[PDB]
Amino acid sequence: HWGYGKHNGPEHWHKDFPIAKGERQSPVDIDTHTAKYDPSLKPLSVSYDQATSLRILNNGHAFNVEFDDSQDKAVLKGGPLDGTYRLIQFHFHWGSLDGQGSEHTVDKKKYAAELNLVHWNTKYGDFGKAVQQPDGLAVLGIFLKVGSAKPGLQKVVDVLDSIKTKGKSADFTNFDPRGLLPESLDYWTYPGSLTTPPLLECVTWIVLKEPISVSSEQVLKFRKLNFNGEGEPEELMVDNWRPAQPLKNRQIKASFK
Ligand SMILES: [Zn+2]
Numbered sequence: 323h324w325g326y327g328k329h330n331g332p333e334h335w336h337k338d339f340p341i342a343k344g345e346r347q348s349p350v351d352i353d354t355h356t357a358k359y360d361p362s363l364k365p366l367s368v369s370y371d372q373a374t375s376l377r378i379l380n381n382g383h384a385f386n387v388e389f390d391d392s393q394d395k396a397v398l399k400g401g402p403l404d405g406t407y408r409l410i411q412f413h414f415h416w417g418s419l420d421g422q423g424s425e426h427t428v429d430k431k432k433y434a435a436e437l438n439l440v441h442w443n444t445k446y447g448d449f450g451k452a453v454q455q456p457d458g459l460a461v462l463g464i465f466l467k468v469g470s471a472k473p474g475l476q477k478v479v480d481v482l483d484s485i486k487t488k489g490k491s492a493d494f495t496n497f498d499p500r501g502l503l504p505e506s507l508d509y510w511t512y513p514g515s516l517t518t519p520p521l522l523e524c525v526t527w528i529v530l531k532e533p534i535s536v537s538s539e540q541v542l543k544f545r546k547l548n549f550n551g552e553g554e555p556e557e558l559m560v561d562n563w564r565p566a567q568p569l570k571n572r573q574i575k576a577s578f579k
Contacts, residue, residue, distance in 0.1 A: 324519050325383065325549060327557075332564045339519045346523040347567040348514035349425035352574055357510055359579040366507045366528065366577075367400035368462075368500075373409065375497040378481055382488035382549055383518060384413040384562055387478065387497060391442070391449070396499070398441045398460055401528055402511045402575070407441035407460040410449055412499060414438070415517075416544045418560035420468045423541075425517050425563045426529050428465075433533060434541055435466035436563070437502060453516070458524035464504065469535035474501020479543045488551040504532035508578040517564045531578065 324330050324338065336342035373396035378387045388411045389396055396409040416435035417423030424433035439462040442452035452458035466472075477497055484492045508531040515523040547559035 326562050335519060335521070339521050341515075341521050341523065342519075344515070344521075344523055345570055346513050346515055346572065347521065348517050348525065348527060349427070349564060349566055350512065350514065350569050350572075350574070351427045351430055351566040352510050352529065354429050354576075357574040357576045360575040360577070363402055363511070363575060363577045364400045366398070366509065368398055368503070368507070370396045370409070370498070370500050372396065373499055375494050375499075377491050378478070378485055378494040379491040380485040380488055380547060380559075382551075384415065384559070385482070385485060385547065386411045386413045387494055387499075394444070398439075398462065401509065401577070402526060403460055404457070406444045408444055409439060409441050409499070412437060412439040412502075414466075414544065415563040416466075416541060416560065417563065418545065418558075420538070420541070422561070423563060424465055425566075426463055426465075426527075427566055433465040434468050435536070435544065437464040437466060437534075438462065439464075439499065453520075453522050453524050455524055456513075457526060458522075459516075460526050460528060463527060463529040464502065465530070465533035466536050466541070467533045468538050468541060471537035471540055472502070472534055474498070475536055475540055479540050482543050482547060486546070486552075487548045490552070502534065504530055504534050506530075506532045508532065508576075510574050510576050512572055512574040 374390040391408040424436035446452040549557040
């Protein structure tokens with residue numbers, strides 16, 4: 323089974339998932355100087371006031387906070403998107419040290435972590451069908467840098483002890499994802515893919531320009547999770563990020579100049 327270790331890491335994925343070498347793989351490095359400001363890009367529309375979180379789960383490679391997506395409760399639209407996208411879950415990628423952890427990079431600069439809010443296009447009926455379409459998913463990428471604590475992230479940090487190992491989950495209701503958004507919604511957008519197998523090229527990436535700050539103590543808590551299941555040898559869950567992939571035939575657009 324794939325992972326992030328020396329023998330089953332990103333460089334090995336192509337053997338079981340040939341699309342790892344495809345034309346629109348993520349993440350990528352965002353070169354702020356060659357990104358084209360596109361005046362036709364609309365402002366993002368994030369509607370999370372009716373969001374219903376259900377639970378948090380350690381899936382062996384990250385932890386996902388899942389939401390009820392049976393109705394248009396938490397949606398994303400506008401920006402470079404056509405149609406409505408429902409939020410299904412959010413997760414993070416982090417490093418063993420503060421100088422690494424993000425998947426996307428800005429001018430080769432790596433951040434301590436990266437938050438991804440995953441949404442699927444309602445036109446397709448369910449998440450499973452959406453991943454098979456070129457415009458099936460819309461993922462919001464938000465960078466985390468170490469500085470002052472992020473109040474809204476604390477409820478997530480405090481629950482991590484109960485989902486230490488792979489397979490564990492915990493009820494996680496009434497969490498408001500609006501507390502994780504930076505103040506500005508300026509962004510870069512490009513056509514890409516899922517960053518973990520099956521690596522399907524069904525994602526319209528929306529990476530926010532402005533990072534959020536989290537405390538050293540907060541990021542430290544992420545590093546206490548385990549890739550392993552209970553009772554097995556302990557492998558700390560750190561560096562669960564895939565390196566930048568070649569841009570190829572793609573243009574990165576910016577909503578700001
Ligand atoms: Zn991710």
